[PDB]
Enzyme design. Structure first.
Site, PDB file in Angstrom:
ATOM      1  N   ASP A 107       1.792  -1.478   4.416  1.00  0.00           N
ATOM      2  CA  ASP A 107       2.226  -0.143   3.904  1.00  0.00           C
ATOM      3  C   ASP A 107       3.652  -0.181   3.425  1.00  0.00           C
ATOM      4  O   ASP A 107       4.550  -0.652   4.168  1.00  0.00           O
ATOM      5  CB  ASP A 107       2.123   0.930   5.017  1.00  0.00           C
ATOM      6  CG  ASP A 107       0.697   1.226   5.425  1.00  0.00           C
ATOM      7  OD1 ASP A 107      -0.238   0.566   4.909  1.00  0.00           O
ATOM      8  OD2 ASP A 107       0.545   2.201   6.227  1.00  0.00           O
ATOM      9  N   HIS A 109       0.854  -1.200   0.000  1.00  0.00           N
ATOM     10  CA  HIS A 109       0.000   0.000   0.000  1.00  0.00           C
ATOM     11  C   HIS A 109       0.889   1.250   0.000  1.00  0.00           C
ATOM     12  O   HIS A 109       1.657   1.490   0.959  1.00  0.00           O
ATOM     13  CB  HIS A 109      -0.901  -0.084   1.212  1.00  0.00           C
ATOM     14  CG  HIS A 109      -1.841   1.076   1.329  1.00  0.00           C
ATOM     15  ND1 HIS A 109      -2.831   1.337   0.398  1.00  0.00           N
ATOM     16  CD2 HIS A 109      -1.946   2.030   2.279  1.00  0.00           C
ATOM     17  CE1 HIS A 109      -3.479   2.442   0.772  1.00  0.00           C
ATOM     18  NE2 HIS A 109      -2.967   2.899   1.901  1.00  0.00           N
ATOM     19  N   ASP A 155      -7.963   1.132   2.046  1.00  0.00           N
ATOM     20  CA  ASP A 155      -7.724   2.138   3.097  1.00  0.00           C
ATOM     21  C   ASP A 155      -8.674   3.338   3.247  1.00  0.00           C
ATOM     22  O   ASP A 155      -8.608   3.974   4.301  1.00  0.00           O
ATOM     23  CB  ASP A 155      -6.275   2.646   3.005  1.00  0.00           C
ATOM     24  CG  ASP A 155      -5.667   3.058   4.361  1.00  0.00           C
ATOM     25  OD1 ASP A 155      -6.082   2.547   5.418  1.00  0.00           O
ATOM     26  OD2 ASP A 155      -4.724   3.888   4.413  1.00  0.00           O
ATOM     27  N   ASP A 203       1.016   5.242  -0.215  1.00  0.00           N
ATOM     28  CA  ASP A 203       0.261   6.519  -0.175  1.00  0.00           C
ATOM     29  C   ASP A 203       0.934   7.626  -0.913  1.00  0.00           C
ATOM     30  O   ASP A 203       2.111   7.904  -0.634  1.00  0.00           O
ATOM     31  CB  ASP A 203       0.209   6.969   1.296  1.00  0.00           C
ATOM     32  CG  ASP A 203      -0.542   5.989   2.113  1.00  0.00           C
ATOM     33  OD1 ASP A 203      -1.725   5.793   1.862  1.00  0.00           O
ATOM     34  OD2 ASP A 203       0.086   5.299   2.969  1.00  0.00           O
ATOM     35  N   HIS A 253      -6.728   9.487  -0.216  1.00  0.00           N
ATOM     36  CA  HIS A 253      -7.370   9.375   1.116  1.00  0.00           C
ATOM     37  C   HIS A 253      -6.546   9.981   2.259  1.00  0.00           C
ATOM     38  O   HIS A 253      -7.016   9.909   3.378  1.00  0.00           O
ATOM     39  CB  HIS A 253      -7.774   7.896   1.414  1.00  0.00           C
ATOM     40  CG  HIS A 253      -6.614   6.920   1.404  1.00  0.00           C
ATOM     41  ND1 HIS A 253      -6.193   6.237   0.270  1.00  0.00           N
ATOM     42  CD2 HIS A 253      -5.763   6.542   2.394  1.00  0.00           C
ATOM     43  CE1 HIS A 253      -5.124   5.483   0.570  1.00  0.00           C
ATOM     44  NE2 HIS A 253      -4.833   5.644   1.852  1.00  0.00           N
TER      45      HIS A 253
HETATM   46  O1  LIG Z   1      -3.225   6.292   4.444  1.00  0.00           O
HETATM   47  C1  LIG Z   1      -2.435   6.144   5.632  1.00  0.00           C
HETATM   48  C2  LIG Z   1      -3.267   5.881   6.881  1.00  0.00           C
HETATM   49  C3  LIG Z   1      -4.581   6.611   7.001  1.00  0.00           C
HETATM   50  O2  LIG Z   1      -4.309   8.006   7.085  1.00  0.00           O
HETATM   51  C4  LIG Z   1      -5.336   6.228   8.267  1.00  0.00           C
HETATM   52  C5  LIG Z   1      -5.508   4.723   8.205  1.00  0.00           C
HETATM   53  C6  LIG Z   1      -4.190   3.986   8.108  1.00  0.00           C
HETATM   54  N1  LIG Z   1      -3.571   4.436   6.850  1.00  0.00           N
HETATM   55  C7  LIG Z   1      -2.222   3.891   6.616  1.00  0.00           C
HETATM   56  C8  LIG Z   1      -1.658   4.834   5.566  1.00  0.00           C
HETATM   57  O3  LIG Z   1      -1.767   4.169   4.291  1.00  0.00           O
HETATM   58 ZN   LIG Z   2      -3.340   4.681   2.947  1.00  0.00          ZN
END
Ligand SMILES: O[C@H]1[C@H]2[C@H](O)CCCN2C[C@H]1O
Ligand SMILES: [Zn+2]
Ligand SMILES: *[C@@H]1O[C@H](CO)[C@@H](O)[C@H](O)[C@H]1NC(C)=O
Length: 1014
Positions: A311, A60, A174, A62, A441
């Site tokens: 992650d 994952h 997520d 971000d 997100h």
């Molecule tokens: O997006 C980030 C975070 C989110 O902000 C809250 C849930 C857990 N997620 C792990 C990360 O990928």
């Molecule tokens: Zn995330």
């Protein structure tokens, strides 16, 4: 067309009905803390019916959260993708799925050709598989559907061009709660399957007990089921390895081979993974297969999905080896031990869904139908994630401004083909990608670290400048005689004027039109209307004299109003919030009338005294202890008085009454009618002094809100023939009610300042007998019925308000439309409330590692529509949807897609024309051209233009509402050679259209069309 109002769909699971019946008890279920001890019959699987297990490796990534996009790319993602390419190339049996195309595109473009070819080969042969294929994995609560489609299209268009693939399975592990707008868009974009994860733990328990975690998710108004998309909801608390192998994390954690020590990770359940050997493989397989068979009990087929990732995983070579080799030892043992009756292997997401549907077609399972949404999410206890519906509201509002600017830039520039030297495609691609990135997100949600929020803001500012450049070059081309048009593609022919962003009191960004007898007598301005119907709207400009008149380009006078320019100041000397007027800048306001998807030019001319067709507003300052407020040449002196109740009426429209504190208290729709109680009130929520603290994600109030103590605030009343307003300086908010003849516009300049651990809410109090029912929208696409549940805490009754909300009884409705997504609710009959900002000193323990202390002034905008609805044909009591009236829908459009305003930047515009688009069809009010985008560059012999057409559904309430013209988007450009209906991303042709005519769509439907031109 299906009737979306009168037929209640029959579905196995309707989320509002489920919510009404569920108890939501948070009981300790054992190792599955939020479930129960799962039991299975070992004889269920045998030689002729094995359990097929697909272990799906994933990472994952971000696009910004604790680090920026570029920081994560340099520190982590480029290494993950480089090592995935090497490991999959060298190990043919290994698999991997990838979701975030913003990163994949950033990586692929930096690869040398040899590696690009290797990458294309592992995608072609099924080893690396793309899931969803959007630029990001977007938030589903605050995002507008138009931007969810924009980012999906940006990633899938990239994938089709460079990878020659279009994903048909979506992966959303997520986002904090899930919206039916996703299957809506995905099913109209060729998808066949989707997966979700963050749904309320009580919902996972309820659906797991009924084996309803896989379902055909249809829209709430869809009677027939044509919108249905197969959906898999994961059953457990997280997508990490401890929560994806089975119900017991203490066991599953032992199968995350990155947690043995050398990688700095461990198992919090205190049992570590151990390397698989021939001496322990039987016992380790016994444990793992038991977890898998328990997970399989929650689903209906003999095909089991086991995600393997977390992650930013699969970063180091050594990690790829430790996971792959240990799982291969387990597979070789398990698959050879007949007694398990399991066949396990690495797989991709599409492989899992293909096997599930093979089982379905063999008559092995039938799936339930479901409608509704999955908000508001709670991951444990009373920790409901309704805080992020409001966190970082400045950027939530910026999202909606950029949404509109991207649509207007793509539409204005689509009318022509442009030379590459004009850099039109370059600037539009930049703008689309920065807005698409912010749908992430951790972007629009307001859940990133402060320096990451700054990066998103910087990227969006550059995108707005790109949109401005493209728009102003397009206006110059569209309104100048062709034989005179002489473009310099780097020159600014016009500057945009935006009265609501960043907004008065937020930035001084607006240019004053400078006129004078010894400098420049007049100035051309142009308005653009992106909507496909003729539209009138008042527009305002700052001018350096109050003696200005307006004309159209046939020189016909246009009625105008001049008002002062008022700025509010928090006076640290007198300790009051009060307005100051300019003695050299003034506002001129007039009604612009613009063709459908068109432009209209006006001229502002200075005179030496009051012009015949310009009137001047009166101004009244209500306060104790007033002081003078000179306004230069402005011809009406400011009046003063002690605070008092006041009433205003503009035009024929409603009469509004205000309290002595400057807040609305009633609305009277007509001369004969009742003064209906409608009161605005500002309140504050605090934070708990022990136990869990509110943060960027969580809203954990210390009880119901308390009224903000107002003191004796300064109230400014401006009364004009075209526009009147009441503005008041309250603590943390300059609140303004503006009247132009219809439903008022509300503007709040919100500056929470240094008020730590405070959330400011704006509430409307009425006597409407709404009971426990209210309606909120999902992604600006549909309104869903909500029921306030007193069995749930206050924060669980908060929902996203991406564009509007309403309450109603048998006779009356109050609708609040918003120009930005915020959180809100109806906590008592007759009330509506919406959060304005929140400042939190504590972190809420979800990984962000900071509170929210970076607030900045933001100008929130709204329209408030009170209406009689006793004559409207509304859905029955059991229907899960609601629908706006015509006036409310038009008010929402006035906030999200206002007219654009351009000021000519030089002294004289040679070859100027008065209008563009007068021959464009004026379509029925419920139809919009959501997207107009030229899809080809100028070198293409056959030009292609794509259109997304959306029809909402408006209530029938007795208005004849009549003559409009059919809109055929395929004939908007000349020389049409072909018209095709396509998926919403424009990537697949679905129907060749007779006569090159694009039919209009049905209520609540969205279609895409591409016209080809020779
Ligand atoms: O997006 C980030 C975070 C989110 O902000 C809250 C849930 C857990 N997620 C792990 C990360 O990928
Ligand atoms: Zn995330
Ligand atoms: C793209 O994929 C299709 C099948 O999906 C194939 O027929 C075509 O040759 C491919 N084009 C390439 C390899 O670029």
């Amino acid at each position: 067309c299906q009737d979306v109002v009168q037929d209640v769909p029959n579905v196995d699971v309707q989320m509002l009905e489920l919510y009404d019946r569920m108890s939501f008890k948070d009981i300790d279920g054992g190792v599955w803390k939020q479930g129960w001890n799962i039991k299975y019959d070992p004889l269920k699987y045998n030689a002729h019916h094995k359990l097929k297990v697909f272990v799906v490796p994933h990472s994952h990534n971000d696009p910004g959260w604790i680090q920026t996009f570029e920081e994560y790319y340099q520190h982590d993602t480029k290494h993950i993708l480089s090592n995935a390419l090497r490991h999959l190339h060298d190990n043919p049996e290994m698999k991997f799925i990838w979701a975030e195309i913003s990163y994949f595109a950033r990586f692929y473009h930096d690869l040398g050709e040899n590696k690009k070819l290797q990458m294309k080969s592992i995608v072609k042969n099924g080893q690396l598989e793309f899931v969803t294929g959007g630029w990001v994995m977007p938030d589903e609560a605050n995002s507008h559907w138009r931007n969810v489609l924009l980012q999906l299209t940006e990633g899938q268009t990239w994938l089709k061009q460079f990878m020659n693939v279009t994903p048909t399975a979506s992966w959303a592990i997520d986002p904090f709660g899930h919206s039916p707008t996703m299957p809506y868009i995905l099913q109209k974009s060729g998808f066949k399957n989707m997966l979700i994860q963050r749904t309320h733990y009580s919902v996972k328990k309820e659906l797991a007990q009924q084996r309803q975690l896989e379902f055909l998710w249809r829209q709430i108004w869809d009677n027939k089921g044509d919108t249905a998309l197969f959906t898999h909801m994961m059953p457990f608390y997280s997508y990490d390895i401890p929560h994806t192998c089975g119900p017991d994390p203490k066991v599953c954690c032992q199968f995350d081979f990155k947690r043995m020590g050398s990688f700095g990770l461990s198992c919090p359940w205190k049992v570590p993974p151990r390397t698989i050997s021939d001496q322990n493989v039987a016992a380790r397989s016994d444990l793992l297969v038991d977890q898998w068979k328990k997970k399989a009990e929650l689903y209906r087929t003999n095909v089991l999905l086991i995600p393997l990732g977390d992650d930013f995983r699969f970063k180091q070579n050594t990690e790829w080896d430790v996971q792959r080799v240990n799982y291969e030892r387990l597979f070789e043992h398990i698959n050879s031990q007949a007694h398990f009756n399991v066949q396990a292997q690495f797989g991709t997401l599409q492989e899992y869904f293909d096997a599930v549907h093979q089982a379905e077609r063999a008559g092995q399972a039938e799936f339930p139908t479901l409608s509704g949404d999955f908000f508001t999410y709670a991951d444990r206890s009373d920790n409901y994630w309704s805080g992020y519906y409001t966190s970082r509201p400045y950027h939530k509002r910026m999202d909606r401004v950029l949404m509109h600017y991207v649509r207007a830039a793509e539409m204005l520039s689509a009318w022509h083909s442009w030379d590459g030297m004009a850099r039109i495609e370059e600037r539009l691609e930049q703008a689309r990608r920065e807005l698409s990135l912010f749908q992430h997100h951790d972007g629009i949600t307001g859940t990133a670290k402060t320096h990451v929020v700054v990066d998103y803001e910087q990227r969006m500012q550059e995108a707005l400048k790109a949109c401005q450049m493209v728009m102003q070059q397009s206006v110059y081309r569209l309104l100048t005689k062709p034989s005179i048009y002489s473009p310099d593609f780097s020159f600014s022919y016009f500057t945009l004027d935006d009265s609501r962003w960043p907004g008065s009191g937020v930035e001084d960004s607006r240019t004053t039109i400078i006129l004078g007898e010894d400098i420049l007598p007049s100035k051309h301005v142009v308005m653009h209307n992106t909507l496909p119907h003729w539209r009138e709207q008042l527009v305002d400009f700052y001018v350096s004299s109050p003696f200005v008149s307006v004309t159209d380009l046939a020189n016909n006078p246009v009625e105008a109003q001049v008002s002062p320019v008022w700025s509010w100041h928090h006076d640290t000397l007198t300790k009051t919030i009060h307005p100051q007027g300019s003695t050299t800048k003034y506002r001129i306001i007039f009604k612009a009338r613009v063709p459908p998807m068109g432009l209209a030019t006006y001229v502002l001319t200075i005179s030496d005294s009051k012009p015949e067709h310009t009137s001047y507003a009166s101004n009244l300052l209500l306060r104790k202890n007033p002081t003078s407020l000179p306004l230069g040449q402005y011809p009406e002196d400011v009046k003063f008085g002690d605070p008092r109740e006041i009433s205003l009426r503009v035009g024929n429209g409603p009469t509004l009454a205000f309290s002595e504190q400057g807040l609305l208290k009633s609305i009277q729709l007509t001369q004969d009618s009742p003064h209906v109680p409608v009161h605005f009130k500002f309140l504050k929520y605090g934070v708990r002094s022990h136990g869990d603290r509110s943060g960027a994600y969580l809203f954990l109030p210390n009880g119901p809100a308390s009224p903000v103590e107002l003191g004796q605030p300064v109230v400014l009343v401006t009364k004009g023939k075209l526009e009147s307003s009441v503005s008041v300086g309250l603590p943390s908010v300059v609140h303004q009610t503006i009247m132009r003849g219809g439903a008022p516009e509300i503007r709040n300049l919100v500056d929470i300042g240094s008020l730590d651990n405070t959330e400011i809410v704006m509430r409307l109090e009425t006597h409407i007998d709404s009971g426990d029912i209210f309606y909120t929208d999902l992604n600006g696409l549909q309104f869903i019925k909500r029921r306030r549940l007193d069995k749930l805490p206050l924060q669980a009754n908060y929902y996203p308000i991406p564009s509007g909300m309403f309450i109603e009884d048998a006779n009356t409705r109050l609708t609040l439309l918003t120009g930005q997504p915020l959180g809100g609710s109806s906590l008592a009959s007759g009330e509506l409330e919406i959060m304005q900002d929140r400042r939190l000193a504590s972190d809420d323990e979800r990984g962000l590692g900071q509170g929210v202390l970076d607030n900045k002034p933001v100008l929130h905008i709204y329209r408030l529509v009170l209406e009689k609805v006793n004559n409207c044909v509304r859905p029955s009591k059991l229907h899960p949807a609601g629908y706006l009236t015509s006036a409310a829908h038009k008010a929402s459009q006035s906030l999200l897609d206002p007219l654009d305003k351009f000021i000519f930047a030089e002294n004289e515009w040679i070859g100027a024309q008065g209008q563009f688009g007068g021959d464009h069809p004026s379509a029925r009010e419920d139809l919009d051209v959501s997207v107009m985008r030229r899809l080809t560059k100028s070198s293409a012999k056959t030009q292609r233009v794509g259109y997304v057409l959306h029809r909402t559904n408006l209530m029938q309430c007795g208005t004849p509402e009549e003559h409009t013209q059919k809109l055929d988007v395929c004939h908007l450009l000349p020389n049409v050679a072909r018209c095709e209906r396509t998926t919403l991303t424009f990537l697949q042709n679905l129907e060749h259209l007779d006569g090159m005519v694009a039919p209009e769509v049905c209520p609540m439907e969205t279609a895409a069309y591409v016209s080809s031109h020779s």
